[PDB]
From a paper:
Purine nucleoside phosphorylase ([name], purine nucleoside orthophosphate ribosyl transferase, EC 2.4.2.1) has a crucial role in the purine salvage pathway. It catalyses the reversible phosphorolytic cleavage of the glycosidic bond of purine (2′-deoxy) nucleosides, generating the corresponding free base and (2′-deoxy) ribose 1-phosphate. [name] [name] is an excellent molecular machine conducting efficient catalysis of purine nucleosides glycosidic bond cleavage. It is a homohexamer, built as a trimer of dimers, with all its subunits having the active site in the open conformation in the apo enzyme form. Monomers in each dimer mutually donate two amino acids (His4 and Arg43) to complete their active sites.
The crystal structure of complex WT-6(P/S)-6FA was obtained with a higher concentration of FA compared to structure WT-6(P/S)-2FA, and this resulted in filling all the active sites, including those in the open conformation. Difference electron density for omitted FA is best in the closed active site A, then in the open active site B, and finally somewhat poorer in the open active site D, which forms an open-closed dimer with site A. This is backed up by the values of occupancies of FA molecules, which in these three active sites are given as A:B:D = 0.8:0.5:0.4. This suggests that in the wild-type enzyme the active site B from the open-open B-B’ dimer exhibits a slightly higher affinity towards FA than the active site D that belongs to the closed-open A-D dimer. It turned out that the conformation of both proteins with all the active sites occupied by both ligands was the same, with a closed conformation in one of three active sites. Both ligands are in the same orientation in the active sites of WT and DM, and the conformation of crucial amino acids is very similar.
Residue numbers in the entry:
A (entry chain A), B (entry chain C), C (entry chain B), D (entry chain A), E (entry chain B), F (entry chain C): 1 to 237
Write the structure that this text describes.
């Protein structure tokens, strides 16, 4: 066991899908995995392992923010033999042409967190996904007939930002979605020697204030999950 | 309701105790509150409202890290009329004279997060508790026969730090405990005009294994909760 | 002797009161202390040691700014056995509910100096006073019929700041008074393991500009010194 | 004409290959392009336009360093209708398993330059290539039977770095090649609304001190050029 | 009058000499100036105005540190028509070829203060003296048979720095003397459109520690003042 | 030979004039030097060595930007015995009183580059010229009947700045000219123990179009070169 996960080596698959919400992890396990068993509930951070089309797969929540997801991803990598992390989540859009429920794939993640500066002697670390994983997700999406944009996410420390003008800067630089984890997960993957990808569904628009409900985010982002799961199968081949 | 809390105005008391673990919020409500009812379960972040010695009190988890607790504390203050937040958590010690099971009260919180620099034009914001709340907690501890230590916490973004050298720096400058939230909560309190306090119990020494028993650790945890609750009664008058 | 203090161990009390204006030290010695003796004259920074109600107390100016007061406070702590420093000064106010002649006690001190970032590996050190000293001052004021406000000061490097907009930021975050020393003194206290407190009287309101009499100013200054001295006696118990 | 390019709209193809060395641009034009004509020689920064397998293509030097290449790429984008920039260059390796003449494709570029912080309100901008361009280069390489790694480059401001320890940090974080332009080109592409990719050939090893000569770099990195040119043809389809 | 100078326009010459130690102002006035009159006494910072070989000159201490000298130099320039400020002080040396009692002229001043970053949008402002003033001082020294070294000073915020290794960095980059004011004075001069120069005599060698006589110190101090005064006359032509 | 210069020790004089444009290095050699021979052509960065009034002198382009000129200046100093570098360039003006065709001598150079912070432990290094070289240039200009202005340059990383607000800041703090190299050259000179100076002619006003003729601009450029060359002769004695 690790300080935040009460499980043993072998309980997790070598690939783990991770939404922020543990209730969404539960939904994914019930809806997409066969013979799913619960493998963690420490701090209510539910994790499950089962199979998808014969392939062993785990799904576990990571909580909100870089510090939360950094703990869970680290522990999975160092103590549970996890090789790939696929974050499956929600984000807010800043671009006019990005719509609710659009799927975005974060090949890179910008951030206002200090965690990567702490790692990288206060220089600019480009927090990037694993290329093969990105390509796998793009291909899986195309096969499912689901549109997906590939580009930069922005991982925010403050959901309620006191700097509204920064959204104009994100928009200027083509940021596809604002979320709170990607740059941290990519930093952990680099630090601890694993591979990661973040896929998000646009759950709200930062400009229009249109948004999905809590229940919607928990149990209604299915296209993203299919993309993630099918992308793993492509990577296996 | 807010995006992260499915409740309405009035469902929370004007004071909320907040552990990081939602299962610990349930623990506190069941152990210390009468007539407690669950008032939130979005993302599994359990919140409850009940009475302590006739006084309406809420308790709700905040999750791990500054970005997680910043979401919940902001929402409680701006949308649920909450006037006081008391974080009740665990911390690690760096000072040799600070022992396992000491109760630490964070009058200030240092941090390696960028959130307060973002708020404060890249200058140094001293993230501080409300003085009257600190005084109420110190007095409640004294009434219970406990000598709390009052000083600085350090709120870390990385539980698994790559630095390591920073622990010697914390020790040099007298930091009493290392946790992951206080500086963020204090920043939110200042930004939105409310009051906050963090109390922690020392759960480990970034150092040896000083060795206690489960019964003793659990007793001290309960003492921290009693301190928090009694401090509210003192503040009321 | 030290580079800036021509005295020997024992010449200073373990508690030193420090005004910014060196002329105030002699005034304090003659007005409040019994049997005062001169203990320093280097650079005209006169220092005196005497008793207040039998308790050994010293007084010496600190000069304007963090670098000046950092020199004197360091030397006092490391070479003269000083345990407590109480800065007694003036500040400017940014909050409209904070009035001329109000007494402000700096439990914390924000700053635009780099000195604490230099100490603390470029992270945020919360520059804080000693809690008991804060509470002693509050209690001493109350006994004198004075209601002190306790909160954050802002310690400026530039009295004449080219960033006028920073005062609005200070106001938003609840800064009680603007001065030029507290964060530096608190940083030295932490670095060398001693205790400090800054008490200020509001001499100006930054935005507007109202007026006061010389007699009103002396009365208020005397009140602050009385608070400081009585607070020491409470600290001794 | 622009301040650093004496040409007119239409003189450049919508895709420009750019090595740092203008003499290499000359070599590429002579060796790979048909009917090549020189279109710029301001400051000796040679640029040419011709065809590759019927496709109009330009090649022009960009000079050494972020500030130099930022000028040329900006001007091409804003005044010459250039849609894609493919940097074709050299880099130094830090990883043990990366060998001389290996081809590396920079999906991302880390940097110690301040240029992207200036663009991005002092936050972390992940300087990334266009995904389709990366995928095109990977596919072209596979078709040519040439191995290519995809990952992060590091764009240095100082070729002669006073901080040798930073190479250990680059190695730790899996940096594939150290060069001096990629992060700047990616920043310009984002700022001015175009697409970019950097492909490099390992010309020296920072640890082993093995290196290619000046003449070698100028006229002997042919596999990289074929990859770049063939990748354009794939993008056209 | 200004907040720190109780004088009116015309009371100060257009050139002011400023030692750090306020006691030195009266010494300079009595020793070098004719017909001196007292023009300030606020906070014991005595100021005087007289003539040297018929030329109107003022002298007043500036206190220790950038924040102190920044207050006085600003007020002198904006409210008293002062055109030139010459700081005359002491410094510590890090270069072994720089000896006790050497005269150093700061054409530039490095710093670890944040004041110039605050002025200059967080970029690097090169804090420099006025060139003619530098050359005047060099020429005045030469006429007196003194060979002054001209180069960079380092203006420290912390006389007691916790970063001992910075002295090695200063040595490597050719810093001639360490003091606490020059960069601040040069920043004020640029901000308010005036001219400044810092001249220092080496009082200590940071690494080692050799000795000197009181008589040697006064001789060297007098030499520095003579250089400063004669340099003004050269500047007038 | 070095990686960027194909020459051997002795091929360069101990003083090298450096324009940004290699074609301008050829211009200078042909116009002002006798018996000039080309000594470098790697990357088209032409360098030449000849005599001026019997004195051995070299001239070689440095390319645009701090990173480019830092490579060439370092190599000249460490591998070719070069003792003095004189950059001879163009700059843009921000001050209304600084006119087209003024000759500006950079005693200091401000910058938005990070290179000197990397050298100097993230503090402010005042990037300065060699005093004797500045004095020699001023004297040579006077002998030729030109009044050079001596002050700060600003060395920009982005010729095409997204800021724009920074030009007002430069004007406020008295910057004489904006170019792209001086601060980097001065940093290299300090790091490797040599001497440097930057002289520029004002080619544009970041402001209007003041309007000159080609003949007049070219005359002033030649005057700058004459100043540089004659200054060397003065330095020799
Ligand atoms: N507009 C927005 N801003 C920031 N984060 C989010 C999210 C994601 O959802 C959580 C906050 O609601 C957190 O995990 C974040 O990654 N959805 N919409 C967002
Ligand atoms: N040594 C330590 N370091 C960081 N955080 C913690 C904690 C707290 O527990 C959580 C991480 O386990 C987080 O909420 C933090 O505040 N206990 N001990 C800690
Ligand atoms: N509005 C203001 N801003 C900055 N400092 C002060 C002070 C104090 O007075 C001194 C400057 O006049 C300095 O020691 C500072 O702490 N009073 N009012 C102030
Ligand atoms: N070890 C190394 N470090 C930095 N840059 C380079 C290069 C590239 O070559 C140029 C410097 O030689 C410059 O354009 C840079 O991008 N090759 N090898 C390099
Ligand atoms: N080694 C040293 N470090 C810092 N400052 C000084 C000084 C000057 O003396 C004062 C501190 O003693 C201050 O004004 C500073 O400019 N002399 N020697 C010094
Ligand atoms: N307004 C301006 N801004 C930046 N650089 C320059 C220059 C110089 O010319 C080059 C850019 O054209 C570069 O070497 C720089 O130093 N002239 N005018 C300039």
């Amino acid at each position: 066991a690790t300080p935040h996960i009460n499980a043993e080596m072998g309980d997790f698959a070598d690939v783990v899908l991770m939404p922020g919400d543990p209730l969404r992890a539960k939904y994914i396990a019930e809806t997409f995995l066969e013979d799913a068993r619960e493998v963690n509930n420490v701090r209510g951070m539910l994790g499950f392992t089962g199979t998808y089309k014969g392939r062993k797969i785990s799904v576990m929540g990571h909580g909100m923010g870089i510090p939360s997801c950094s703990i869970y991803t680290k522990e999975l990598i160092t103590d549970f033999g996890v090789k790939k992390i696929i974050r499956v989540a929600s984000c807010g859009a800043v671009l006019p042409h990005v719509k609710l429920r659009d799927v975005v794939i974060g090949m890179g993640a910008c951030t206002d967190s200090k965690v990567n500066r702490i790692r990288f002697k206060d220089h600019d670390f480009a927090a990037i996904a694993d290329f093969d994983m990105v390509r796998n997700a793009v291909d899986a999406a195309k096969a499912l007939g689901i549109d997906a944009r590939v580009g930069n996410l922005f991982s925010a420390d403050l959901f309620y930002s006191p700097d509204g003008e920064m959204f104009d800067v994100m928009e200027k630089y083509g940021i596809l979605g604002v979320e709170m984890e990607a740059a941290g997960i990519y930093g952990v993957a680099a630090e601890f020697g694993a591979k990661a990808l973040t896929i998000c569904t646009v759950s709200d628009h930062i400009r229009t204030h249109e948004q999905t409900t809590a229940a919607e985010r928990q149990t209604t982002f299915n296209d993203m999950i299919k993309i993630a799961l099918e992308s793993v199968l492509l990577g296996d081949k």
